[PDB]
Amino acid sequence: GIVPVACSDGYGGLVTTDPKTADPVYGMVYNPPRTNYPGRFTNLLDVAEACPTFLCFDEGKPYVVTRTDEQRLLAKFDVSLAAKHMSNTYLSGIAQYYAQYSGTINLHFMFTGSTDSKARYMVAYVPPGVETPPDTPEKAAHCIHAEWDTGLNSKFTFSIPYVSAADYAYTASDVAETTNVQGWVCIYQITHGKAEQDTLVVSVSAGKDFELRLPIDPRSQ
């Protein structure tokens, strides 16, 4: 006699993401060597961590600038990988293919002004719960924030913290909801000296614990 088997209903169909392998038909193929080929990356986030890309502000400029020396809200944007200001970044490029994330997102600020121009800036993380963002450094001071001088070192990095009710947040956005909008980031200029035409270039990268979760194919094809 032979082995009895029950060909089971509901099993067997092809699933584009299944964990099995096909049957081979052309054996004994040896490839040209590619040992130590340069620039290899094995995880998208290793790249997203080390290579910050630029934010997009008014008229598509990767920077902000103000002609007045008074306090001003230079820019505000939503803490969403779906944000308009993030739309040209590599981080957002990667994130559109995952349903959820959690973790630190790092902002980088680089001053490009002349030796004779000085400024003092502030960056704040405004969590959800307030109707609109603070329009002044005074009101925003009560939030998690950092202030800095322009000097010998042109770059300043700040971590936007992951603070939410759920353990993960959606990468996409839909309408003002708790799972898809995690507050705002506000960048202010406290004041400046002779920096009317000088700019602050802003870029973003992934933090030490930034994480993307569930693979998706949502682009219109």
Binding site: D167, T178, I216, D217
Partner: protein
């Protein structure tokens, strides 16, 4: 036994008190993981459907038991009878994604498709009742197991795997008019 009832401390008196003897009990059937581990129907279907265990019938074996808990967690298995190919996307995915093969897509194979899916919500556990809003009654939109889409979805069956239930809530039998018993036809040999 006599006790102070108001405290509400549990009291389990026994037959021994008046000379009886307690008898060995096997309770495997009432075990939560076991009892929830079976396929149950979902009635309101559409070619694009978001998997929501609250879609289970309120008086169904699983439907009622699930309702009799406030919080729960579990993995899942589904059986779908569909025309065309079936695509599933995880919790949080744009509805637009159901149109693409890159997401788990099962090519039609009679008589239907049976799949094992993981819990994908962003919360540590889900709820059958939620006193409040998720937007800046119904349950928050994030309480789901993803969505499925095919040309036509004729049948859906769901099965709760590794189920965990917390915080039990009321569970009701049918109400009785008679004032003596609820009587109904119990199976019995013909003739």
């Amino acid at each position: 036994t006599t006790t102070t009832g108001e405290s509400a401390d549990p009291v389990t008196t026994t037959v021994e008190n008046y000379g009886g003897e307690t008898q060995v009990q096997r309770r495997q059937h009432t075990d939560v993981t076991f009892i929830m581990d079976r396929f149950v129907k979902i009635q309101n279907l559409n070619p694009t459907h978001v998997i929501d265990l609250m879609q289970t019938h309120q008086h169904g074996l699983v439907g009622a038991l699930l309702r009799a808990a406030t919080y729960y967690f579990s993995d899942l298995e589904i059986v779908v009878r569909h025309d065309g190919n079936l695509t599933w996307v995880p919790n949080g995915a744009p509805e637009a994604a159901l149109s693409n093969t890159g997401n788990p897509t099962a090519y039609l194979k009679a008589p239907f498709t049976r799949l094992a899916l993981p819990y994908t919500a962003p919360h540590r556990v889900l709820a059958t009742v939620y006193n409040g809003t998720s937007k800046y009654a119904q349950l928050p939109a994030s309480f789901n197991f993803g969505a499925i889409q095919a040309t036509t979805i004729h049948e859906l069956l769901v099965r709760m795997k590794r189920a965990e239930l917390y915080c039990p809530r009321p569970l009701l039998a049918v109400e009785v008019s008679s004032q003596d018993r609820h009587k109904q036809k119990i199976i019995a040999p013909a003739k």
